[PDB]
From a paper:
Here, we present the crystal structure of C. acetobutylicum thiolase (CaTHL), a type II biosynthetic thiolase that catalyses the first step of n-butanol biosynthesis and condenses two acetyl-CoAs to acetoacetyl-CoA. We reveal that CaTHL, unlike other type II biosynthetic thiolases from aerobic bacteria, is regulated via modulation of a redox-switch, indicating that n-butanol production and the relevant metabolic fluxes in Clostridium are tightly regulated by thiolase. CaTHL consists of three domains: an N-terminal α/β domain (N-domain, residues 1–119 and 249–269), a loop domain (L-domain, residues 120–248), and a C-terminal α/β domain (C-domain, residues 270–392). The N- and C-domains form a typical five-layered fold (α–β–α–β–α) observed in other thiolase superfamily of proteins including peroxisomal degradative thiolase from Saccharomyces cerevisiae, β-ketoacyl synthase II from E. coli, and the biosynthetic thiolase from Zoogloea ramigera (ZrTHL)14151617181920.
The 1.77 Å crystal structure of CaTHL was determined to understand the structural basis for its catalytic and regulatory mechanisms. The asymmetric unit contains two CaTHL molecules, and the tetrameric structure of the protein could easily be generated by applying crystallographic P21212 symmetry. Interestingly, under oxidized conditions, a disulfide bond was formed between two catalytic cysteine residues (Cys88 and Cys378) in CaTHL. Such disulfide bond formation has not been reported in other type II biosynthetic thiolases. The disulfide bond formation was followed by a large conformational change in the catalytic cysteine loop (CIGGGQG, residues 378–384). The Cys378 residue rotates 180° towards the Cys88 residue via the rotation of the peptide bond between Leu377 and Cys378, which in turn induces a movement of the catalytic cysteine loop away from the active site. The consequence of this conformational change in the catalytic cysteine loop is that the region between β11 and α10 (SAGVDPAIMGYGP, residues 280–292) becomes disordered due to the steric clash. Hereafter, this disordered region will be referred to as the flexible region. In summary, the oxidized CaTHL becomes inactive due to the oxidation of both catalytic cysteine residues accompanied by large conformational changes in the catalytic cysteine loop and the flexible region. Interestingly, in the oxidized form of CaTHL, the conformational change between the ‘catalytic cysteine loop' and the ‘RDR' forms a hole that enables the cellular reductants to access to the disulfide bond.
Numbering used by the authors:
A (entry chain A), B (entry chain B), C (entry chain B), D (entry chain A): 1 to 281, 291 to 393
The structure:
Amino acid sequence: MKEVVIASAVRTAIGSYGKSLKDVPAVDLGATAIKEAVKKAGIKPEDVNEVILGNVLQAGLGQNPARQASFKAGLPVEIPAMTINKVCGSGLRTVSLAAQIIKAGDADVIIAGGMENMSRAPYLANNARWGYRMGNAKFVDEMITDGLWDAFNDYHMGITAENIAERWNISREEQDEFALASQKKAEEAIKSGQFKDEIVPVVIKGRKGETVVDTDEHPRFGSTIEGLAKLKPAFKKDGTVTAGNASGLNDCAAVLVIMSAEKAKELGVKPLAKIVSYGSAGPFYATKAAIEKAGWTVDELDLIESNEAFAAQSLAVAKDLKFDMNKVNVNGGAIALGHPIGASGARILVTLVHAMQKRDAKKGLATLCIGGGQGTAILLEKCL
Amino acid sequence: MKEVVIASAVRTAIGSYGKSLKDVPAVDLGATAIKEAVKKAGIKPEDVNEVILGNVLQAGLGQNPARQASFKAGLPVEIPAMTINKVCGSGLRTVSLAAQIIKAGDADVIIAGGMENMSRAPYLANNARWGYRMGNAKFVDEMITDGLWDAFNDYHMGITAENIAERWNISREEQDEFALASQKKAEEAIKSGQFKDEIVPVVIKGRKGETVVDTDEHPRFGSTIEGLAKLKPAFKKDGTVTAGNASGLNDCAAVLVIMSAEKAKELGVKPLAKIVSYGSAGPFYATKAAIEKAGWTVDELDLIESNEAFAAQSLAVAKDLKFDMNKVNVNGGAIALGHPIGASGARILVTLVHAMQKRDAKKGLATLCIGGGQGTAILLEKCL
Amino acid sequence: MKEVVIASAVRTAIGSYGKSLKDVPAVDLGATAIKEAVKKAGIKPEDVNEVILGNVLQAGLGQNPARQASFKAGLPVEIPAMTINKVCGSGLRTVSLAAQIIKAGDADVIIAGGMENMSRAPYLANNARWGYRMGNAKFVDEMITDGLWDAFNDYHMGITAENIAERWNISREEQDEFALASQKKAEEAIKSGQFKDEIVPVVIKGRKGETVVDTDEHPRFGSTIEGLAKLKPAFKKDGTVTAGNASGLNDCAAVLVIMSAEKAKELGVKPLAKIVSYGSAGPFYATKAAIEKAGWTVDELDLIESNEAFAAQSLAVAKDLKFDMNKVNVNGGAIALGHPIGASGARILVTLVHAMQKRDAKKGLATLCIGGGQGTAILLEKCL
Amino acid sequence: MKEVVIASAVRTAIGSYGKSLKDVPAVDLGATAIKEAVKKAGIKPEDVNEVILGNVLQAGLGQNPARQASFKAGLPVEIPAMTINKVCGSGLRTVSLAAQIIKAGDADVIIAGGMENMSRAPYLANNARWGYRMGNAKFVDEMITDGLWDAFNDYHMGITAENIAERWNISREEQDEFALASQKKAEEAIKSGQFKDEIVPVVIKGRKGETVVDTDEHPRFGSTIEGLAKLKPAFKKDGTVTAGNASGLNDCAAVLVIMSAEKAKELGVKPLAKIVSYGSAGPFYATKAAIEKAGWTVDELDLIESNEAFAAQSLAVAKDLKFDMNKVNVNGGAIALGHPIGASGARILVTLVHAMQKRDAKKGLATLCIGGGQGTAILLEKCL
């Protein structure tokens, strides 16, 4: 079984809803990240065998958004590309799929990751083709429907988080303290340059000027516990979940170059980390199973990226798995940084791997999504 | 490494645009085919490790259409699922992905295939979220944009078919004769029961009555060469491509149970065929290379399913690879039967494997899509 | 001051929702009726001083639908035109407005009436211009909102009819018997040619063929009391109002040439009737006051057109004013014939004046709409 | 023939497109103006006989927008109301219609004028009811279609203005100088309080605060000829018409209390002016005809409001009629102040009448719209 490594890991800044990246289609974010990921790996476009990218809000983006990103990045037209939708899991699942294809003997170099522009999601008229006949109907927000709405229970993902808060008995105060810590860690990380290596600038050329976007926009610098304590609940009357202890709606692309170890050696590439194990192979058993498959334990881990869609979910996973919180989300998490759904799993992988390199941490975990069959996790070991 | 087999192969009937399946969401078609594939394979739903389904027109379908199909089929909620979009290749690429995952050692049993309901595609308002400001705008046909429109050339797929017809001198008459033979072959296949093993009925509950859909409705029985010659070009003035020599807009799901040979033995499954090679591993080099990797030649093949999106494109492939037309699309092709894009690759593989069983044909090829990076192909060898 | 006469009165057939006139814009219906009214009056288009037409569902019809009808009819471009919206009263109020303008000394000849195509009403996105921001919204049925929905009570017009039925004890059986008689009377009127003088054919050019629409299509011939008793309440649980005892959604134009008596003499016109009084000059005091202003009583009337939007409302008016039902809606009413809102008041006046001519009835009343400020009524006296 | 007078004249500020009045429905603007007009006339709500209001963009505003405004202003529910659409002519035509009804003997007190909120106009889906079937379609800007688009020539009203510029040979420079003079006069008028009497404040109550809008927003203070000379043409390549020498898209209501002289005497009302004549009764013959009907001449006039939809149109009318430009639009015109189409005619009447009172000008003209059968004009004589 071939060893599989991460050659490069790059992301755009994470934009806020309707703000810095509103005018930049997901496929263009993806192209910008691909082009740079190839350059950082020290390979040529011709060396890439396949492109596999997460994207959740595909509506109206045109045929095969991953292929569009590939093309717009300068990759040969003949490189096959596919777009993967596993909602929250999309961006990380492309990385493990890449590893699987490499293990199967069918490729040596794969561009993986994800892209999302939630700011640009359409509205839909579902019955426009054959007609509404009579009566008011729903003008459907496609971002909510395709990205945020529980298709079975018929409520917002925010309601699942409220149920997890109740079930694990996680208070409003515990959630807001967790949020404030994410905010603080993100602020110092940004100000201390921890994201400078991993972020590729996005250049927006107007008719009249150019704007460069290279900094994560979503963090609220100078956050306070009092500010958080005043917030109104987002999802239900008397809820614990607010806009302040949950992530946002955000825009980003995050891409990694995944290679066999053998090809990386052949191409002179110095790999960042090796992919030791992944969830494909309590209710957080994907994460537990990936750790076990690595032959590791939670105590052994040096750094952990555990996504913060909701503070209540992050805290439940952390209590159940007994994470040392000093090693969790060291540069801030999704409450501060944002949750661009299709790209989010890849984004935290990009952040983990750069953090491992900067901090000399040997063992890393990236985990996100919760609930049976949705959890996605990868274990990384730093290349010496 | 591991040998990979097809345990079962099932599809719904293919509906015509706005007709028999207009009221059945893609996910429900998918669920129907999944449930029956699992039964036909003689395994339990809990023996399934992962679900991978193609679906192109995902807009407004809700989170993770593959997951919804899985759950609606009665598969355990904790089985992971992902939705794949590769446009034309989606349904067949899920089968090779399954084989790759099994080969990597990460699964024994995977549900693969695809689903599409083109009749139900929405219209889109792309700038409803932050506003149109002023001026008329496009009310977007999501089916055309996401499924049928070339994102780089900014024209319809139909133009590509015209381009191929032009470049190869595939005349209107030749395309019409090909279309007629496809029509005649579908009619005889349907009337002789050739699809009865592979079709799972769909049950539609009306207000009073259940309706059963179990027959492919797109074929135009009694078609004639004179009828086809009267039609007007559909895509360009003085063109060759018409409604009559092109496939339709169609609704279907097609699902296969893919397993390791070793797990099939263990579970007492009698498999239908072995997957010998696949495209991921002239301008139709994907298919050529797939054929070579199996150790075969085109002459050695017993049956061939080569998708008919457009007669022009099918005739171009057959000419280039020198197919014996007597072995091609023996039960009719997509011009007669329909082209439900996400499901189509899976649909032709379902029709191939049953036709191999019935006709005692040892070596089979399924191929669809044209152009570098897009060709998808699978070679099958029938099990003793 | 001046006496005011009706020179001519013409209407299109009334189409059913989504049927015979679905392809004919309101303005084209209006143009057809205008052109023929002018011919029937025996005047020249240039003798016309002003055009005043009712139209309720104006959305997306383009600038000044009345003006478009005028111009499409071949009236001189310099004739001023205006579109009036009073919902239910629109078509009849244009006739009294015409009389008022003539009485003020500012015109001799005015085209009045109304037009509506309910089948063609749009759907609306009210927040498309500056954006929805987030969340599902309403895709608005403009026909219901602009035409059928009570803007103060925020319920359907149908609820008002239920309210009246409730308050007056107008039972389901009584409403159904009224509906049946309306059906029977329309059927006999249509079959006996009673509408042949007043209907102008509409010519629809299909791709191959012109189609002629010249017959009211909404009546349900062969209706029976048992058929009506089986229907379910349409507006509220255990209601009295049904599809069967209420009017439909309909398409029509109805136009009258209104002139001073002195100009009619001058131009050699033989007028059909004199306008004696009008509503603008119990809770049906508009009609009562109109009757009194003519110097008349209800008993003195020879024929009455009282609009049937809902049987409940028609029975309430007839009870209160003590109409002799043998003189009411002698050729059938709106339950059978349809209720094209903008045109309806004009339509019933057209049917009244021809019925007076045919039946030699001297004194006529046209009345529609209910509730203070909304009642519209006109009294006619036939010319010798 | 009764004499007819203006008891009161009130308007909201004129808001800019998407700005100060974006959140205030036309009917609420109308209600605010009605309520104040009644108060300023020194009458009670009960003294009003009828409500007649211009409104062009009625789409989705609900049943009978004029009646909604009446109700929301506190006028008795039983007062009849109608909504008039003559596009550009709407707001002034309601005033002459009011005069006609009063002359005919049918009312003593009428609320007239107009209301428009162009910022709130919907987008439309015209084929949503019965379906689009397949293919992209138009998402229709209803403001452009119903308010600004020539229904016959199939181009923007801006193109008519370009044609008038060419026809009368009115240069870009002449147009921009006219615009700059409008801008300057508007700026001094605002700053010198000339609009303080006529403007009623609009109070926008948020969830969290109140905002008061009482000043016209559209003027560009400090305009310069160089600034205007740089502007790009708005409507065609190499055009003379720009955003700087044409009016905007704007929001306003303007209402007047119109009474017989006899009723005004009876109620103790001191009238502002008498309505001497009106266009209902070269290509600017409505204006010429109204002047003649008054028994006046252009030289006799003391003040003139001639609307400035486009500088090119304003200049053509002024050259043809030989206006003394020192008496034209003395407080600025529509280029500076805005063109809220349904209300615009009434707005300039409101401005004329207050200006006549402040400047002691005896004879006034209000004129707007151009082209056969569209021109609307009124002549006023100040009450001593």
